[PDB]
């Protein structure tokens, strides 16, 4: 009766989305061809064809056929409806202007046509999920367009955006600061919640916990899919304390402007042959709060916490969480803002996390997923502002954007929107 629709745009969104749908079918027993071998939890992410197979509630968007036909020729060709794999003709080529004012308008009409065709079939929509890598043209340009259009088409409907912000020092492009600044203004007021998912932190977790010296994009997407699976596990599985999507953004958002999140997951256990350990609730919670364990390159000890949402799945007893939470508060390195005396919300689900056969993670009876709001998140905006400062000062690469539908103005208020946003975090965190 409850349904959620997922939207994938850009190569970054497509690849991370491929891992998620691999994970979800394993949880619900769906074969890669979609046919059940040998209930009704699958209704959240799947729609019955009438007799037999199931169809995911997703649509794929990109301006290059290279990724889309790979899905259409891979092992998951049997699963998707043929028209939700929207394919373009020419790429934006890391050009925000092309993906926003030049070639994005010939495909956005087709998407919204398919968007409505999935919403009317369902009845109890909770929110939308959109995946994209902000450091690209079509990834950010189309994402900004979709959010703006969906804002007036639906209005009060919840939307979740799991953006992948550029890393502090490593990157694959050279003009990615330009796209990130422009898109951030668009999504500052068009999405209900967003999370920080930069690449360096995921590299650090893989190198440290998994002890893998050969990490690639396949491993990163698998970790992200685990956060997604735990995040929506309360919607399709019976739990001691059920918490819904609308239960999230009414509790983690003090003011409408401040709705940027960061994630952490624990435990991360390699696939070795040791006896391992029981991994009690008290110790898995401690690892979730480790500054180095956060899935974003943000130091929580550099700021103050505002709110925290923690999800436990396994056989966790509410008393153990309550004892563990009390101990965390007493620790001096973790502090909260004065005007927020209580800042913890907990959800418990009975279904244990699943393991992908052939994957890197192992089987564990306890796991925790964390989403928190902290004053320290102001540091990432400052560094991209400085990076974009040295860029726009001598007006480099600008003429490419100007000649493709952009004028000189938008770089101006994009500066001030972040400057206003940065000042907002500074004034919220000050003592009363």
């Amino acid at each position: 009766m409850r349904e959620v629709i997922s939207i994938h745009v850009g190569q970054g969104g497509i690849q991370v989305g491929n891992a998620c749908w691999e994970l979800f079918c394993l949880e619900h027993g769906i074969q890669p061809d979609g046919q059940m071998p040998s209930d009704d939890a699958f209704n959240t992410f799947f729609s019955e064809t009438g007799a037999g197979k199931h169809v995911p509630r997703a649509v794929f968007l990109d301006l290059e056929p290279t990724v889309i036909d790979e899905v259409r020729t891979g092992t998951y060709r049997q699963l998707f409806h043929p028209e939700q794999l929207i394919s373009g003709k020419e790429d934006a080529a890391n050009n925000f202007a092309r993906g926003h004012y030049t070639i994005g308008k010939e495909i956005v009409d087709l998407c919204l046509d398919r968007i409505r065709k999935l919403a009317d079939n369902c009845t109890g929509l909770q929110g939308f999920l959109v995946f994209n890598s902000v450091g690209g043209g079509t990834g950010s340009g189309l994402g900004s367009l979709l959010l703006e259009r969906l804002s007036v088409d639906y209005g009060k409907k919840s939307k979740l955006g799991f953006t992948i912000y550029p890393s502090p020092q490593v990157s694959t492009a050279v003009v990615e600061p330009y796209n990130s600044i422009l898109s951030t203004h668009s999504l500052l007021e068009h999405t209900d919640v967003a999370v920080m998912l930069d690449n360096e932190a995921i590299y650090d977790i893989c190198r440290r916990n998994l002890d893998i010296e050969r990490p690639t994009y396949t491993n990163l997407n698998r970790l992200i899919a685990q956060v997604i699976s735990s995040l929506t596990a309360s919607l399709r599985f019976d739990g001691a304390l059920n918490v819904d999507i609308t239960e999230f953004q009414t509790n983690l958002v003090p003011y409408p402007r401040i709705h940027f999140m960061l994630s952490s997951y624990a435990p991360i256990i390699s696939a070795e042959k040791a006896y391992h350990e029981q991994l009690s609730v008290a110790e898995i919670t401690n690892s979730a709060f480790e500054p180095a364990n956060m899935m974003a390159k943000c130091d929580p000890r550099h700021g103050k916490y505002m709110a925290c949402s923690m999800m436990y799945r396994g056989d966790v007893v509410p008393k153990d969480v309550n004892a563990s939470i009390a101990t965390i508060k007493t620790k001096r390195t973790i502090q909260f803002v004065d005007w927020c005396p209580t800042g913890f919300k907990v959800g418990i689900n009975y279904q244990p996390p699943t393991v992908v056969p052939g994957g890197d993670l192992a089987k564990v009876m306890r796991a925790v997923c964390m989403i928190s709001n902290s004053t320290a998140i102001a540091e990432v905006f400052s560094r991209l502002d400085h990076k974009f400062d040295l860029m726009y000062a001598k007006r480099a690469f600008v003429h490419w954007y100007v000649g493709e539908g952009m004028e000189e103005g938008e770089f101006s208020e994009a500066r001030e929107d972040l400057a206003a946003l940065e000042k907002d975090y500074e004034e919220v965190g000050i003592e009363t």
């Binding site: 019955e48 009438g50 007799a51 036909d69 259409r72 020729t73 060709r77 049997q78």
Partner: protein, 42 residues
């Protein structure tokens, strides 16, 4: 044996012409009724 437009590998190798597009995944054999059935109340 995937020579040009001869045997099923993918739509790119198909590039069918003339009347329609060839069968792709498996399809039901001949005359399966498509869609959710109805008209039941017990």
């Amino acid at each position: 044996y995937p020579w040009n437009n001869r045997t099923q590998n993918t739509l790119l190798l198909k590039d069918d012409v003339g009347r329609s597009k060839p069968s792709a995944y498996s399809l039901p054999p001949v005359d399966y009724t498509y869609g959710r059935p109805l008209e039941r109340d017990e």
